[PDB]
Design an enzyme around this catalytic site. Structure first.
Site, PDB file in Angstrom:
ATOM      1  N   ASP A  24      -8.927  -1.257   0.879  1.00 14.31           N
ATOM      2  CA  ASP A  24      -9.026  -0.762  -0.489  1.00 14.31           C
ATOM      3  C   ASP A  24     -10.258  -1.316  -1.190  1.00 14.31           C
ATOM      4  OD1 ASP A  24      -6.705   0.612  -0.124  1.00 14.31           O
ATOM      5  OD2 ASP A  24      -5.472  -0.642  -1.318  1.00 14.31           O
TER       6      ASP A  24
ATOM      7  N   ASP B  74       0.895  -1.213   0.000  1.00 13.89           N
ATOM      8  CA  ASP B  74       0.000   0.000   0.000  1.00 13.89           C
ATOM      9  C   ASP B  74       0.864   1.171   0.000  1.00 13.89           C
ATOM     10  OD1 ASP B  74      -1.690   2.107   0.334  1.00 13.89           O
ATOM     11  OD2 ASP B  74      -2.736   1.335   2.016  1.00 13.89           O
TER      12      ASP B  74
ATOM     13  N   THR C 206      -2.748   5.348  -4.609  1.00  9.70           N
ATOM     14  CA  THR C 206      -1.628   5.718  -3.751  1.00  9.70           C
ATOM     15  C   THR C 206      -0.297   5.615  -4.483  1.00  9.70           C
ATOM     16  OG1 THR C 206      -1.448   3.462  -2.866  1.00  9.70           O
ATOM     17  CG2 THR C 206      -2.864   5.009  -1.677  1.00  9.70           C
ATOM     18  N   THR C 207      -0.238   4.824  -5.556  1.00  7.06           N
ATOM     19  CA  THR C 207       0.967   4.772  -6.376  1.00  7.06           C
ATOM     20  C   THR C 207       0.854   5.694  -7.583  1.00  7.06           C
ATOM     21  OG1 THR C 207       1.424   2.480  -5.713  1.00  7.06           O
ATOM     22  CG2 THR C 207       2.512   3.296  -7.703  1.00  7.06           C
TER      23      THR C 207
END
Lengths: 535, 31, 49, 523, 523
Positions: free
Chosen positions: A399, A68, A101-102
């Protein structure tokens, strides 16, 4: 010069000026972009189905392995004022949407990287920032063109399960690729408010206990608390529970103010002994008169109470916490009763089988509720063979729960796998030449930056980014643009309609908008005044 | 033929003797 | 090899000899105050008494 | 990352030493406990440098690892794995540590051959599924005809104990463990079997107490021996009653009223004991301290008083004497009394204990464990805990498999036979999985000193055509039938070793970067 | 050993870390230079600590290893091996280094199997003999029919150069290597082919000088160009002759005699030059310096004179001009002169050099090496030295073998086929020898980035059924015929790689104990 004037005297403007640093030019801008490259090089390694994990070692020696990005970037020791903002970018995406998040770091980094050539071409730093807005509007407007959904949130939850599979496919819980996808759908739809499209995060609790395997993760239609029956010989099974939720200790009532009882005579001493005995009997009979057969108390018990609980066949547990008695009362349809004398049958909770579970050699004694009546709260019970897979499983299901909530908020979806990003890059390129007044270089740079995602995905998938990108981009032009993406195993063809790679529309809309704004506020800087050593 | 051989090249080759020597130093203390 | 006690080990004639000297060191004091012909001792402590 | 570092006191390693140091640490754990795998393993001495050095001799892999203090952030992954194995089943803690290490050793070679780390993981997931079926389809069930199940319990008890200090004492401790569990007649609480450690005598001089032993000798003014006693236990207050009114004082005009209230106090203590005595009792055991005042009042009645035997002593006593906690004594007709034959005191190792002999409904026991040294007592106690934990679960789930490497060979062949049906991209990883399973009987033979180079070949040949019960006979140094020799292991212990070894290894293999925060309080 | 230490300041390691650290330290040498094996490898830069750091860029393993400064007493064993390979044949220095490292890696794995170190050594001795026969039976001879012999020299030159900086310049530097050697038609002195390094132009602009270049420009008062010159070389004194009387003084009554003796001093120098000039010469080269007085005499005579071209320059001139050193001149009729066409000076890289063109019996040449940078010049020079060293030996021993991994698979085949005829105690060691031999074509493919998983399997499968010329095609990434492609290696280079790795590797296996003397001059 500082500290030396033309007359030989010292020249002092600001405190401790000899320990300061200032460098403006184009060097502040190149330093900001260069520092961002160090950040982008980190997150690009965990993008896509083959994304690699990070091991984070905390200051106290604790270690957790996660995928994450919210857990990776939040544990950094980077002392750079702009790199810290790159973390805030991932935070804003995590708070609003909870998926990319990436992505927002990789995209924002590409915008900073591609901007490097634009400064070297002599384009004013601010004109670059404005040029990205003209191109970003094009990508956003086209992003909303291709979208469709058949999700009704009633029974046809097939595309909703598929969305959960797309999200979970990137996590370390693919051994439960189907099982956790179904748990996440059932957890939200049983508590979501269809009237307003609101989901209350407090109605889904996530618990866990070390041991077993991921396949043993279950959704419990009820509440799980730490059970500790005050009487060790009390029966541990209730078939039909009539639950009294009480926030008063099982002891003689005392005033809250200073009391200091005056006892003078022996008749006073002995009379009090009798009155106190009666208080212990009344407080228990006041429960039985309501038909209750299980009491749950925020406070503890006196030794006298435990015997009366036995003789009246009235099981009870002790020291149940604030949020636990709050959730129990709601889940069971009851109310919290202040005192013993205010007890009434109308405030009792209704539940089915009440049992405690023993786990191996330990004494955890966890609650399970089997049946309930129109409960609006659920509990997830996560198992696992080690502490790390359980904590990562908590984030993996988080998520999955978040993207379900996002579809409830807005049921418009797009095709993933890079199809949306490549299509946007092509759309911007087509309009980048309408019209090349001043911004031709900047708008093309934006279109190129959009490709950082299918390119990084291709690298992590083991493909050459030139051989992959040139084929897909050609195929999306030679024919009416299909939802053509990329994958590692190809799964036959790369038709996203057949692979069922589903992503939320509002997710990507935020990724583009938030990444663009973050780039702007760190380009339009040409002076950093950070202090050096203390002395 | 020797019917095989067991090669043992590790710390026990020295530890098992040191443990005895330490015990002897005390055992003789009360001789 | 040697005894694994963190102190010192002394046996045989070493301690047997020291035991006698310690006793003699004390006797060397009192022998000078035997009989009506002995003389007085003066003792002074660290603080001056 | 190493160029233009923006970290304050932190650092990170990528793609070069991140995976190397992860493999080095994981193998370092495996090599530590490797020597404890099998019935001929050696024991370790664990000591600190001082400040209560806490010298301990131990064999069990989990006990070893939990007292080392591993610093490497990647090696800690396997330490936590061995912890969970200890908590769940209490056996095989060495086997799961060794297996995971051998899997990772092969993975290092596979990565070195330029095989993508996700392909290696995918291959092991397929191999694991193949192994799961081998264990399930080979299970042996036991249902009724108890005279056959008790024989299996003797084999299971011996199999666990063979690996611990209690080696040549099987004639005593194997029956001890099986009988103590059979007497539970219920859930495997693992609290109803108490072990008392005393110095003096040999390990074979221990015995199983059919009653219950208490500390805290019989009173002052009370009989030392009562026949056919009725037992009442208590969880109440004897003195300093300070009855439930907080903030109450004695406010008087003279000294006479103070003495009169003091007289009232002793009247209440007298009444309290009389309310208890109406039960018709010979014994009174109270969790809380018993003061000199009720001691005389009970003495006049000939009732034994035992104080503060333990916090939970009232719970164990209730189950082994057939009574109830009885925290309040105001309805003698609603309180059950226990029963025993003798409450006499016994001398065990020059220490007096109170012995409740011939108890009714005695759903508990005590083991009186004797030995020469504290190290013998502590390791022998752990040996009892390990065997009792496996037996307490065996009586719950009667599915067993054959040991001595038999289960490992059956799993290794299941992976191999299916690996040969898969393309070479992944089969190379499935072969490594099977190899790690075969390393286990190899290491077991190597610790004993057997020529593993040939015995492994004998097993591979034997299991090629039937012989699904063939395994390694650690007594003679040959291959024999596990059913005849009596070498069996529980289904549940073997299942968890298979599952958790792969899960833990995957976590390690997926990491390409270790990011290390700056330490605090280190200067 | 660590208990009851009786050493002053020394230490020792036995049976635990002695072999572990020896294998780790030595095997690491192979991984260092592993990347330089094959035609697609990358080059290294080696840096010093400072004080004119003298940066070196190089590919050859010998130049890498000899500048590392290895401290490990066991790793030094392989460093010396690579020195010998460089001194003997001048090629294959990477191949022998990595082969020995792979053999040692296997030995550590064999020790883990509890195989006695003397059994491992014995197995390698038998495997080595098997490999030696594979090379003897596969050698390719070249005798007469010069149109085929010259092609072999072009193939050997191309193969060696393909691994160095001079990659895409093969059409220029292949001829510079083969033809320069063929023109010598004599002893392989390896000094008759001089290289002059100049900045300016590209590598492709290098050329071969048909004549001989000298430094030390043509005098002050002397002709600059003479056609059809006769050349005389000398190793005599020009001035301060101090003829052979030690401790002699001039002691006179007046300075008139000193002046008269001074005239006599010059008269004898005049006679000396006349005795040289009677030879009938146009060009005079003397090792010793020329002073003002003979310089005028040679100028007046119309004869040029070169001073101190080099220490060995006169010896080299003797070989390329066909004359004699002539350190003394007292019988002009017994002194042989040389002859050339031009003695003119030429401008090469903004530097005037004396060019002797058209020289009779010119058994020598000079290569003019041009490049953009000093690092290019130094590595390009080494490439010429390496190719010339191999060619100077190929023209003496015409036996060659097929390259591209062909010879390596043939050796591994012979070892495998015979290992399967031996008992397992030793066969496991012979097989490990063959496995190391197959690592060489694996490393070559792996450095290029080819799918070695298929090239190794296809090459072995080819050689399993004839196809004794099969090898790696490093252009397409497939298996091809080495004879058609023209990929060959010198027999002597391949023999020494096999023998040296085996002999050196035994040195490590034989050692179980390292004793390290107390260091000196370390404070």
């Amino acid at each position: 010069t500082l500290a030396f004037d033309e007359y030989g005297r010292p020249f002092l403007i600001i405190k401790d000026q000899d320990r300061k640093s200032r460098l403006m030019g184009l060097e502040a801008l190149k330093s900001h972009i260069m520092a961002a490259k160090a950040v982008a090089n980190t997150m690009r390694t965990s993008l896509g189905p083959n994304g690699l994990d990070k091991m984070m070692v905390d200051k106290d020696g604790d270690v957790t392995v996660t995928n994450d990005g919210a857990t990776i970037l939040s544990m950094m020791d980077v002392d750079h004022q702009i790199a810290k903002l790159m973390v805030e970018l991932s935070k804003s995406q995590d708070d609003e949407i909870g998926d990319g998040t990436t992505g927002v770091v990789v995209l924002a980094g590409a915008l900073l990287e591609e901007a490097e050539q634009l400064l070297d071409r002599g384009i004013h730093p601010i004109r670059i920032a404005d040029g990205y807005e003209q191109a970003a509007r094009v990508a956003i407007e086209h992003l909303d063109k291709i979208s469709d959904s058949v999700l009704v949130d009633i029974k046809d939850t097939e595309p909703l399960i598929q969305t959960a599979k797309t999200t979970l496919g990137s996590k370390v819980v693919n051994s439960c690729h189907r099982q956790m996808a179904e748990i996440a759908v059932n957890a939200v739809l049983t508590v979501a408010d269809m009237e307003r499209r609101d989901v209350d995060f407090e109605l889904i609790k996530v618990e866990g206990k070390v041991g077993g395997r991921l396949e043993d993760t279950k959704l419990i239609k009820g509440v799980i608390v730490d059970k500790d029956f005050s009487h060790p010989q009390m029966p541990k099974k209730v078939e039909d529970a009539k639950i009294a939720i009480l926030t008063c200790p099982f002891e003689p009532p005392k005033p809250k103010t200073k009391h200091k009882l005056d006892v003078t005579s022996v008749e006073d001493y002995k009379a009090l002994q009798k009155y106190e005995k009666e208080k212990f009997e009344e407080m228990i009979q006041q429960i039985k008169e309501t038909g209750a057969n299980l009491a749950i108390c925020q406070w503890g018990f006196d030794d006298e109470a435990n015997h009366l609980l036995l003789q009246n066949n009235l099981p009870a547990v002790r020291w149940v916490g604030g949020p636990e008695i709050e959730l129990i009362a709601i889940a069971t349809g009851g109310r919290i009763v202040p005192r013993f004398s205010e007890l009434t049958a109308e405030k009792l909770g209704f539940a089915g089988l009440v049992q405690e579970i023993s786990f191996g050699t330990t004494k955890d004694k966890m609650l399970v509720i089997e049946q309930c009546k129109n409960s609006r709260a659920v509990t997830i019970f996560i198992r696992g063979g080690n502490k790390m897979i359980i904590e990562e499983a908590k984030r993996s299901l988080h998520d999955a729960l978040c993207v379900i909530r996002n579809l409830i908020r807005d049921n418009r979806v797009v095709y993933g796998g890079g199809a949306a990003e490549i299509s946007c890059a092509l759309a911007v390129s087509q309009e980048a030449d309408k019209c090349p007044t001043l911004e031709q270089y900047a708008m093309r740079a934006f279109a190129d930056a959009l490709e950082v995602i299918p390119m990084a995905l291709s690298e992590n998938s083991g493909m050459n980014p030139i051989q992959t990108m040139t084929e897909v981009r050609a195929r999306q032009v030679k024919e009416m643009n299909p939802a053509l993406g990329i994958d590692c195993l190809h799964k036959g063809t790369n038709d996203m309609k057949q692979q069922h790679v589903i992503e939320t529309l509002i997710g990507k809309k935020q990724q583009i908008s938030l990444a663009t704004q973050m780039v702007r506020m760190i380009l339009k800087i040409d002076d950093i005044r950070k202090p050096g050593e203390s002395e | 033929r020797g019917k095989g051989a067991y090669q043992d090249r590790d710390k026990p080759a020295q530890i098992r003797f040191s443990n005895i020597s330490a015990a002897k130093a005390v055992a003789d203390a009360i001789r | 090899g040697p005894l694994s006690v963190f102190g010192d080990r002394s046996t045989g004639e070493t301690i047997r000899s020291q035991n006698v000297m310690a006793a003699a060191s004390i006797a060397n004091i009192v022998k000078s105050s035997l009989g009506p012909v002995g003389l007085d001792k003066m003792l002074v402590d660290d603080i001056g008494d | 990352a190493p160029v233009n570092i923006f970290k304050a006191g932190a650092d990170e390693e990528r793609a070069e030493t991140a995976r190397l140091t992860s493999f080095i640490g994981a193998i370092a754990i495996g090599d530590l406990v490797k020597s404890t795998l099998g019935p001929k393993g050696m024991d370790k001495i664990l000591l600190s440098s001082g400040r209560d050095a806490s010298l301990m001799v131990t064999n069990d892999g989990a006990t070893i690892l939990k007292n080392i203090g591993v610093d490497n952030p990647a090696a800690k992954v396997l330490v936590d794995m061995s912890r969970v194995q200890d908590d769940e089943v209490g056996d095989g803690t060495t086997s799961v540590t060794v297996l995971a290490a051998e899997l990772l050793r092969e993975a290092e070679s596979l990565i070195a051959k330029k095989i993508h780390p996700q392909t290696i993981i995918a291959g092991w997931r397929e191999a694991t599924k193949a192994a799961r079926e081998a264990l399930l389809s080979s299970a042996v069930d036991h249902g009724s005809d108890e005279v056959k199940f008790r024989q299996d319990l003797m084999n299971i008890a011996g199999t666990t104990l063979s690996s611990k200090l209690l080696t040549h004492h099987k004639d005593h401790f194997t029956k001890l463990a099986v009988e103590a569990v059979l007497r539970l007649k219920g859930s495997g609480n693992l609290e109803a079997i108490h072990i008392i450690k005393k110095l003096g005598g040999s390990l074979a001089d221990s015995y199983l107490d059919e009653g219950f032993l208490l500390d805290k000798k019989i009173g002052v003014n009370q009989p030392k021996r009562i026949e056919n006693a009725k037992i009442l236990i208590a969880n109440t207050g004897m003195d300093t009653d300070k009855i439930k009114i907080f903030g109450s004082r004695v406010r008087v005009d003279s000294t006479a009223k103070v003495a009169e209230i003091e007289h009232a106090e002793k009247e209440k203590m007298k009444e309290k004991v009389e309310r208890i005595l109406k039960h018709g009792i010979n014994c009174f055991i109270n969790r809380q301290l018993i003061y000199n005042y009720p001691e005389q009042l009970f003495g006049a009645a000939g009732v034994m008083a035992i104080e503060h035997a333990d916090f939970a002593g009232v719970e164990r006593l209730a189950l082994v004497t057939g009574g109830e906690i009885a925290s309040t004594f105001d309805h003698p007709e609603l309180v059950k009394l226990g029963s025993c034959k003798l409450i006499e005191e016994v001398m065990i190792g020059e220490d007096k204990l109170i012995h409740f002999s011939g108890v009714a409904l005695g759903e508990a026991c005590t083991i009186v464990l004797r030995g020469a040294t504290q190290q013998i007592l502590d390791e022998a106690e752990r040996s009892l805990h390990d065997a009792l934990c496996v037996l307490a679960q065996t009586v719950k789930d009667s599915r067993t498999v054959y040991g001595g490497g038999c289960s490992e060979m059956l799993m290794a062949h299941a992976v191999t036979q299916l690996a040969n049906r898969t393309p070479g991209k992944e089969a190379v990883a499935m072969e490594s999985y099977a190899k790690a399973l075969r390393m286990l009987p190899t290491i077991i033979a190597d610790n004993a000193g057997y020529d593993s180079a040939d015995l492994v070949a004998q097993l591979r040949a034997a299991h090629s055509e039937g012989n699904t019960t063939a395994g390694l006979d650690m007594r003679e140094g040959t291959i024999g039938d596990m059913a005849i020799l009596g070498i069996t292991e529980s289904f549940q212990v073997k299942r968890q070793v298979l599952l958790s070894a792969a899960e833990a290894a995957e976590v390690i293999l997926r990491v390409d970067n270790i990011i290390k925060a700056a330490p605090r309080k280190r200067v």
